[PDB]
Amino acid sequence: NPIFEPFIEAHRYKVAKGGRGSGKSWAIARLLVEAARRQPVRILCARELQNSISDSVIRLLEDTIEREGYSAEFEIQRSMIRHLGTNAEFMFYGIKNNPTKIKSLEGIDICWVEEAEAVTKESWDILIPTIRKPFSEIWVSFNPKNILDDTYQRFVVNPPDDICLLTVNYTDNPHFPEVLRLEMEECKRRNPTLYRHIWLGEPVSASDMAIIKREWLEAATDAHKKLGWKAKGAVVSAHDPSDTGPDAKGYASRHGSVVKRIAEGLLMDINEGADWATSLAIEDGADHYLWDGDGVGAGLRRQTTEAFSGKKITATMFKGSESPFDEDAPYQAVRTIGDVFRNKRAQFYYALADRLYLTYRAVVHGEYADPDDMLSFDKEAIGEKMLEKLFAELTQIQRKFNNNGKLELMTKVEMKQKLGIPSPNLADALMMCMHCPALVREETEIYVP
């Protein structure tokens, strides 16, 4: 397979990146087998996680060997392949599984890291210094996930010396099989964005129109712990009722500048969702509750206020399509709020982005900022799983062009259509949390000006 010829020459790093069905795995297994037939090489096949030997490439190597008719040249055991002439040897370990064993390995000439998109930073940091024999090589094959993932950073963005980087897709595969073609064509039609990621190997990256950067979010995680301040203020919760579609319902809650809960609501109708979200608000001790009223949520006001009966909890229907709040007020932090934002959705997503950016500059560049103007994610309270789902949605929120030079964002419907992603309801819920239109004191009425 001609494109791989540079892997035959000596290079410290040989990295093959591409999408599904590119032929990169078959090529590498073939080259490694042919090398083993000729040189007494010790070859480590490594991956992030190996729960059983069947997760490794040993079966692929056996098939290659059998395919080319080399069977009689080899010894084959459960977890090892050895060439009878050269004494070359394949071995197979997971990095996360037994790091200790990997560090102890000696005389390794070639390490193949397969499915390397899964390989974490700490894994590379364990693995790479163990491959220390002079002229030893590290071969890497992976299908890019995110541009910010360590593997993509390490070999594409900030690449080491002496790297042979090949980029391959199914069109570079002369024996691209029908079973994969059908699946590829089907995917190309149903979801073009997913197709380019899976089949053309394009990593997930930030649109140049995105408004919130991932590095801000990472800095913002536990920023209150990093910078040494406590949550102070009212509790605000918000609910995104989603649609009648499959998309999960959203809930977010914060205590002042510290977000404390992010939740998804699955397999609920509209009333179940409202009941779920209002119950969370009560459990979170909310002083203020908002929900998206622009769609299916427009009828939820009665159920919502009833759920709060007897409790001093403000209840506000958020309509993101409306003119911005206080639109005639001068813009801050002759130009009015109305000149700047098309609508409430943009207004409050930018309030969120601004808080996040300010926190990022505080954490990363030591620039002082009032905690009140920042936003921290309480990782422990929220849980890593929900936090990551939220972040994956926030990094996709994007600005679109506007013919009055106003700030405007792609709607949820537009995102779903163009990006092929589920509605970003966790992100919208958090956005609505940024808004506090209802004035209240323990000693007074609730006043909505």
Ligand SMILES: Nc1ncnc2c1ncn2[C@@H]1O[C@H](COP(=O)(O)OP(=O)(O)O)[C@@H](O)[C@H]1O
């Ligand atoms: N040199 C080859 N000879 C015959 N078939 C091949 C060859 N290279 C790839 N293929 C076919 O293409 C398919 C995908 O190749 P593979 O290396 O698994 O791609 P990737 O690892 O990039 O997803 C294989 O399952 C095999 O059927």
